[PDB]
């Protein structure tokens, strides 16, 4: 129970850091933000937590892309041997 209480404290701190990023309102509560670089441009992100801080908005703009690079895998050839 001692180690269990410490694991729940660690889980509570990680859950608090997760729900910092979580929007306070619901999902359909639509918030659109236009960020500009000092080179004048308009980039639109959709979120409520990303409205206030720049880093969550830039993490959204990084995460909104659907193209992923190839990561080659060794395919775990150790299991082929007995």
């Amino acid at each position: 129970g001692f180690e269990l209480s410490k694991l729940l404290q660690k889980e509570h701190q990680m859950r608090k850091n997760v729900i910092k990023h979580t929007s306070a309102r619901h999902s359909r509560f639509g918030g659109l933000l236009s960020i500009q670089t000092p080179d004048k441009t308009r980039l639109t992100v959709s979120g409520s937590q990303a409205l206030v801080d720049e880093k969550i908005a830039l993490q959204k703009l990084d995460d909104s892309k659907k193209w992923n690079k190839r990561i080659i895998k060794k395919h775990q050839s150790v299991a082929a041997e007995g």
């Binding site: 659109l32 236009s34 004048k40 441009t41 308009r42 639109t44 992100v45 909104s64 892309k65 193209w67």
Partner: protein, 345 residues
């Protein structure tokens, strides 16, 4: 596949006639062009309803006949096909839009800021070291008013007298409105925003159904071919106050042994909510068909419904001096008793 025919109506000459009529005509019979003053009030945001009167057009072509020249019978071309001529008059108004003469209040208009940023986009991208649909920028709702006392639109018709040959034409009906639905917003331009390229796209709606756009078709978004997902924005979308109501044939117009028929009237823009249930009204509107989409259009085939896009609505229906005259008449009780229901004794 699509063979072509020739018709004796020139749209370019008729468009020139419309854009000369907008700057030429002035009504001095009541006692500067008055329609230009109305478009100036549109530019000053004074009014949102522009009513083109066909009696004014008939008097304008009569004045042209007095000058000795001849028109191309513009009012008959309005009465034959008013649906294309609505957009033609809208483009003629947009070609002759006056400059605003008062405070713009630029903070309220979001579409002005969006189009300013898109013109910045266009000058920056094409620096090299139509952009918007016309219904998005339109703040005015166009209506038509039929000619009277001067000819099919002038003659009022029953619901049963409206036939299949009256589709596409400006008609007039007399009837009692049975059911009026709630005022609902109907879209005309949908705005989608790209989360990657930061651009927009506008999709126009001219049907009962529409499909959304999934991926952006921007030049910058497709040059690097990133697959940005489009997001619909209701803030920059173009809306209209649409209301559907049902008009019924009057019982005097119904022949003996028949059941009255009902017709659908769709009102848009500033003409909304004037229709009331249980009200005998005259409705002048463009008689347009209502086509389906998809499987209903495939199964029902050529058999298509219809509706009415209303353009003008007319209601069929000192006092103290008359009260004092009734006082000096004397015996108000007996006079108001015996005057009510004169068939009894």
């Amino acid at each position: 596949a699509l063979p072509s025919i020739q018709l004796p109506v020139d749209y370019n000459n008729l468009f020139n006639e419309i854009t000369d009529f907008l700057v030429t005509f002035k009504q001095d019979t009541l006692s500067g062009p008055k329609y230009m003053a109305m478009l100036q009030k549109v530019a000053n945001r004074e009014l949102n309803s522009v009513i083109i009167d066909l009696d004014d057009i008939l008097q304008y072509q009569n004045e042209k006949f007095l000058q000795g020249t001849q028109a191309d019978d513009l009012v008959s071309a309005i009465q034959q096909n008013a649906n294309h001529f609505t957009e033609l008059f809208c483009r003629a108004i947009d070609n002759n839009m006056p400059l605003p003469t008062k405070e713009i209040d630029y903070k309220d208009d979001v579409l002005d800021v969006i189009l300013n940023q898109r013109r910045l986009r266009n000058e920056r991208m094409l620096s090299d070291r139509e952009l918007f649909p016309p219904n998005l920028t339109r703040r005015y709702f166009l209506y038509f008013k039929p000619l009277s006392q001067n000819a099919i639109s002038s003659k009022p018709l029953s619901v049963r007298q409206i036939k299949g040959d009256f589709l596409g034409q400006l008609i007039t009906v007399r009837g009692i409105i049975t059911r009026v639905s709630d005022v609902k917003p109907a879209v005309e331009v949908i705005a989608y925003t790209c989360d990657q390229c930061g651009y927009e796209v506008f999709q126009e709606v001219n049907s009962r159904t529409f499909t959304p756009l999934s991926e952006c078709t921007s030049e910058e978004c497709s040059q690097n071919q990133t697959k940005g997902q489009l997001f619909m924005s209701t803030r920059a979308s173009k809306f209209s106050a649409f209301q559907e109501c049902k008009i019924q044939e009057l019982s005097q117009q119904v022949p003996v042994g028949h059941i009255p028929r009902s017709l659908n009237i769709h009102v848009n823009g500033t003409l909304v909510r004037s229709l009331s249930p249980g009200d005998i009204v005259d409705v002048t509107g463009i008689f347009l068909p209502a086509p389906y989409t998809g499987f209903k259009a495939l199964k029902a085939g050529l058999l298509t419904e219809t509706y009415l896009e209303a353009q003008f609505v007319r209601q069929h229906k000192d006092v103290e001096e008359r009260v004092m005259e009734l006082i000096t008449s004397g015996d108000v009780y007996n006079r108001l008793a015996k005057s009510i229901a004169p068939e009894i004794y």
